[PDB]
Amino acid sequence: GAMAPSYRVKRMDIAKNDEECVVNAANPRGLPGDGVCKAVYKKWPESFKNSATPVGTAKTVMCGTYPVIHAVGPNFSNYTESEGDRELAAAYREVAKEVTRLGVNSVAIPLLSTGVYSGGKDRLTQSLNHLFTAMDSTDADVVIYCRDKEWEKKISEAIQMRT
Ligand SMILES: [Cl-]
Ligand SMILES: [Cl-]
Ligand SMILES: [Cl-]
């Protein structure tokens, strides 16, 4: 465990993270994809061997000894708001199981279903709240990665609000 488990947020490429493992915002087919997924494919391509997994699940593959947790959020273009919300919550619960099983003291995590799977809606609060619901009972240091300056400010405020 971390001595004083924390949440932090950084605005940078998650492929440059300083944590003991990474969560990929994966597709269900284990394809290179785009955005975070493409960055993860460039940095850790070995981790895409048999990484395909269904929506709402996470599957860990090692790149050397560095764990890549492939977490598949729903594409809100295809899911109803109700079913997508249930699958997005479930993906983060499977992330928390993997982080715990791996025994890591820190994890780098993007906001699932906020980019090309958002169905064109702002899901910062929805995705971050499901992240907190899953991760709050874990003792890993969590570092959230984002790219947008306004998102950085809103995620940082949400973390500080809980103290
Ligand atoms: Cl960067
Ligand atoms: Cl996405
Ligand atoms: Cl972002």
Curated annotation (Swiss-Prot):
UniProt PTM comment: Phosphorylated by host on serines and threonines.
Location relative to the cell: Host cytoplasmic vesicle membrane
Stretches assigned to the Macro domain: 4-163
Reported effect, residue 13 to A: Partial loss of ADP-ribose 1'' phosphate phosphatase activity
Domain of life of the organism encoding this protein: Viruses
UniProt effect for mutating residue 117 to A: Partial loss of mono-ADP-ribosylhydrolase activity; complete loss of ADP-ribose 1'' phosphate phosphatase activity
Recorded topology in the membrane: Peripheral membrane protein
The record's note on its domains: In the N-terminus, the macro domain displays a mono-ADP-ribosylhydrolase activity. The central part called, the alphavirus unique domain (AUD) has a zinc-binding function. The C-terminus region, also called hypervariable domain (HVD), is mainly disordered and binds several host proteins. This intrinsically disordered domain contains 2 SH3 domain-binding sites and 2 FGDF motifs necessary and sufficient for the formation of nsP3/G3BP complexes.
Function: Seems to be essential for minus-strand RNAs and subgenomic 26S mRNAs synthesis. Displays mono-ADP-ribosylhydrolase activity. ADP-ribosylation is a post-translational modification that controls various processes of the host cell and the virus probably needs to revert it for optimal viral replication. Binds proteins of G3BP family and sequesters them into the viral RNA replication complexes thereby inhibiting the formation of host stress granules on viral mRNAs.
Protein name, per record: Non-structural protein 3
Organismal lineage: Viruses, Riboviria, Orthornavirae, Kitrinoviricota, Alsuviricetes
Full-sequence portion shown in this chain: 1334 to 1493 of 2474
